[PDB]
Amino acid sequence: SMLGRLNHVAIAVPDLEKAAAFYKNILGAQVSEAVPLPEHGVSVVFVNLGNTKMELLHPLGLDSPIAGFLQKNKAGGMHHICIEVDNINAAVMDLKKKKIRSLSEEVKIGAHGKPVIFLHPKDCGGVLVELEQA
Amino acid sequence: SMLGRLNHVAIAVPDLEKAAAFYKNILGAQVSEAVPLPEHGVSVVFVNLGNTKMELLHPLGLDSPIAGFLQKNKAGGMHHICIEVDNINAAVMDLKKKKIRSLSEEVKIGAHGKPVIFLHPKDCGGVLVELEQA
Ligand SMILES: [Co+2]
Ligand SMILES: [Co+2]
């Protein structure tokens, strides 16, 4: 099938250090060191749950894509899910053909250095969905 | 005691049939029939992504535990993540000993027929977390 695995659940957090330490030292998760991603305006910590990852995100620089989310959601919150696709270009053409209003039109290189597209919550799906080339 | 896999990401949706059909017929996901869970005050559709599932949730009756979420988030939204643990009782005692204010006291039987506990976003972790016995 075109649609694949859940690659990550992304959580925006107001304190990346504290969030990472909670998963690591309270819950006993496998947690990475923080990685700055300046191109993407965030810092990330990866929580490896074995089957998938949680990405803990915090703004990096004054123009972060998640800065506005953290003003609304001061305690942090679930920000998006990311599901893999076998072929992102075939997937974009298909979704364009289906004429869905949530499609974000332009394929960009995402935080993993692979092409992605975002579907906003505009067709009953209920969540921001990042689709990433597998 | 030891933390395990992500069992599900739960999404609250204002229209369960519309959300299910989006995943199935727009994204090409494997999607269950809607299952009412009256004891838990919701109806669920399971989206099987192979590595984990999405549980799409809609209120069933008046005092649904997600009814209040759906008033705040009219388009619906990510409601919780569920992570497995090998021993729910051990985890509850460990968490009670760590004195974390996110801990929700009562072990209940969840929709999967397994004991669960919830931790709220009160300790820098960013999301509602359900822990469920493996
Ligand atoms: Co992402
Ligand atoms: Co759940």
Key attributes of the depicted protein:
homodimer; 134 residues; alpha+beta; 2,3-Dihydroxybiphenyl 1,2-Dioxygenase, domain 1; nine-stranded mixed β-sheet; 3 helices; 37% strand; binds cobalt (II) ion
Number of helices of chain A: 3
CATH homologous superfamily designation of chain A: 2,3-Dihydroxybiphenyl 1,2-Dioxygenase, domain 1
How much β-strand is present in the residues of chain A? 35-45%
Terminus-to-terminus distance of chain A: 12 Å
Over the alpha carbons, how many angstroms does the gyration radius of chain A reach?
A: 15 Å
Q: Could you say which small molecules are bound to this protein?
A: cobalt (II) ion
Apparent shape of chain A: globular
Biggest chain-to-chain interface with counts: A-B, 42 and 43 residues
* Structural category of chain A: alpha+beta
CATH arch. level architecture of chain A: Roll
CATH class of chain A: Alpha Beta
| Pattern of helices and strands of chain A | EHEEEEHEHEEE
Helix content of chain A: 10-25%
Number of strands of chain A: 9
The CATH topology of chain A is 2,3-Dihydroxybiphenyl 1,2-Dioxygenase, domain 1
PDB class: isomerase
Keywords: structural genomics consortium, SGC, vitamin B12, mitochondria, isomerase
Assembly: dimeric
Entry title: Crystal structure of human Methylmalonyl-CoA epimerase, MCEE
